[PDB]
Write a protein that holds these residues in place. Structure first.
Motif, PDB file in Angstrom:
ATOM      1  N   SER A 118      14.083   2.665   0.935  1.00 48.30           N
ATOM      2  CA  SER A 118      13.483   3.610  -0.038  1.00 48.30           C
ATOM      3  C   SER A 118      14.314   4.897  -0.064  1.00 48.30           C
ATOM      4  O   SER A 118      14.629   5.398  -1.151  1.00 48.30           O
ATOM      5  N   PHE A 182       8.781   1.661   1.816  1.00 47.08           N
ATOM      6  CA  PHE A 182       8.315   2.212   0.515  1.00 47.08           C
ATOM      7  C   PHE A 182       6.847   2.679   0.652  1.00 47.08           C
ATOM      8  O   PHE A 182       6.500   3.732   0.088  1.00 47.08           O
ATOM      9  N   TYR A 194       8.905   5.257  -7.566  1.00 41.11           N
ATOM     10  CA  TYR A 194       8.575   4.494  -6.329  1.00 41.11           C
ATOM     11  C   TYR A 194       8.170   5.455  -5.204  1.00 41.11           C
ATOM     12  O   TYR A 194       7.890   4.978  -4.082  1.00 41.11           O
ATOM     13  N   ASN A 200       2.637   4.848  -6.716  1.00 38.30           N
ATOM     14  CA  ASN A 200       4.120   4.847  -6.776  1.00 38.30           C
ATOM     15  C   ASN A 200       4.686   4.198  -5.506  1.00 38.30           C
ATOM     16  O   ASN A 200       5.567   3.309  -5.644  1.00 38.30           O
ATOM     17  N   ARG A 203       4.371   0.543  -5.704  1.00 35.03           N
ATOM     18  CA  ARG A 203       5.001  -0.159  -6.861  1.00 35.03           C
ATOM     19  C   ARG A 203       6.012  -1.210  -6.370  1.00 35.03           C
ATOM     20  O   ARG A 203       6.089  -2.291  -6.982  1.00 35.03           O
ATOM     21  N   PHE A 204       6.769  -0.941  -5.304  1.00 37.17           N
ATOM     22  CA  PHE A 204       7.773  -1.929  -4.805  1.00 37.17           C
ATOM     23  C   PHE A 204       7.067  -3.198  -4.338  1.00 37.17           C
ATOM     24  O   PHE A 204       7.410  -4.325  -4.794  1.00 37.17           O
TER      25      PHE A 204
END
Ligand SMILES: Cc1cc2nc3c(=O)[nH]c(=O)nc-3n(C[C@H](O)[C@H](O)[C@H](O)COP(=O)(O)O)c2cc1C
Ligand SMILES: [Cl-]
Ligand SMILES: [Cl-]
Ligand code: NA
Length: 360
Positions: A118, A182, A194, A200, A203-204
């Motif tokens: 990330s 993440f 992300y 957010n 989201r990954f």
């Protein structure tokens, strides 16, 4: 109502019991990350488990840093997995492949490339390499191109798992690896979509899960989360604000089953006063819920009796008790596991723990 000995359905996987073998990295694959014939024996020995979750299996060279761990990106890996998976099925067992991207928890001496994450962070402590423990390297923060490529690798790994004959997959979204990097604010410093707010940071995980679901079916897809406890330099300071919505999302996407690894304030594989989120997750995730970490026979029987879990995954006990279910059923003592051979190369501390039939 349910006991450890009652069958359970993991989507279309008909497990004979609710005693799951938790995922265990053993490093008995070769240096090209191709599984070995000794791994066929290890998994066949443990086929009385209602479900086996494999050792973490690399989706890509980039995402596999663990020396002598297997992958499932290549045709050679698929071919080597097939007889392993076949031996388990010939014993009436069930097995799912745990899909691994290790994110920043790799060394370039193993992957050939910078660790990716990330954000451009450095994991604390030392990383395993073929030449011993080395200092962790700072990772690079993945861009849109990287995210498209990694989603592709998750898709290809999922398809290869079904190709190898696995009954399903579990997305490794736990223990401070890519997806967990993440999820946690500690490891996710991203300014893009992300990063920042929970939705957010989730989201990954969402995009990985959606891609796997699209490739092999939601009903063949499981996930592992480790909500509570800093595992390997990876803590959220408000874990319920990301882990309950993540579980809600996994419910909404049709994910067939969820496993939670939950350290206790006095855990043997992690210690934390960050409470367990299992009760809150149980309300928002409604398909089979598997709990893991420091379970005994009685603690597991009680979790199930009180509706806290549908099944329990045992790690270390399945290292040294290939016939764990039979031992629990007959009130036979469990054999201790040898920590020194967790991650060594040989059959010693791997295939040489007898069943309460096969030796002393
Ligand atoms: C040698 C070893 C290897 C492990 N490998 C993995 C792995 O590949 N993937 C994973 O998600 N967790 C892994 N774990 C964590 C275990 O699945 C499990 O969560 C942990 O051992 C706690 O459960 P237990 O108290 O029943 O052992 C590993 C643990 C050990 C001791
Ligand atoms: Cl290399
Ligand atoms: Cl974690
Ligand atoms: Na490990």
């Amino acid at each position: 109502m349910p006991t450890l000995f009652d069958p359970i359905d993991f989507g279309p996987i008909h497990a004979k019991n609710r005693i799951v073998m938790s995922p265990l990295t053993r490093g008995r694959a070769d240096k090209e990350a191709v599984p070995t014939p000794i791994m066929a024996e290890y998994y066949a020995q443990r086929a009385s488990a209602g479900l086996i979750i494999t050792e973490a299996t690399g989706i890509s060279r980039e995402g596999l840093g663990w020396p002598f761990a297997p992958g499932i990106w290549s045709d050679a890996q698929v071919e080597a997995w097939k007889p392993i998976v076949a031996g388990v099925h010939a014993k009436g067992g069930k097995i799912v492949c745990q899909l691994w991207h290790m994110g920043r928890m790799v060394h370039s001496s193993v992957t050939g490339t910078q660790p990716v994450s990330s954000s451009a962070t450095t994991a604390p402590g030392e990383v395993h390499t073929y030449e011993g423990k080395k200092p962790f390297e700072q990772a690079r923060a993945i861009d849109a191109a990287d995210i498209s490529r990694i989603l592709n690798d998750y898709e290809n790994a999922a398809r290869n798992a079904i190709r190898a004959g696995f009954d399903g997959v579990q997305i490794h979204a736990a223990n401070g690896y890519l997806i967990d990097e993440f999820l946690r604010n500690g490891t996710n410093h991203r300014t893009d979509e992300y990063g920042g707010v929970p939705e957010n940071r989730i989201r990954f995980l969402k995009e990985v899960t959606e891609r796997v679901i699209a490739a092999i079916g939601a009903d063949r897809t499981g996930v592992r989360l480790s909500p509570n406890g800093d595992t390997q330099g990876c803590i959220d300071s408000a874990p319920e604000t990301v882990f309950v919505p993540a579980a809600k999302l996994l419910q909404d996407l049709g994910v067939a089953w969820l496993e939670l690894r939950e350290p206790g304030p006095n855990g043997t594989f992690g210690k934390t006063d960050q409470p367990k989120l299992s009760p809150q997750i149980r309300k928002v995730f409604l398909r089979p819920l598997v709990l893991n970490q420091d379970y005994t026979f009685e603690a597991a029987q009680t979790a199930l009796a009180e509706g806290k879990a549908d099944a329990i995954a045992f790690g270390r006990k399945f290292i040294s008790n290939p016939d764990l279910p039979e031992r629990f059923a007959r009130g036979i003592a469990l054999q201790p596991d040898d920590m020194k051979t967790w991650y060594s190369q040989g059959p010693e501390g791997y295939t040489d723990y007898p069943s309460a039939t096969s030796g002393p």
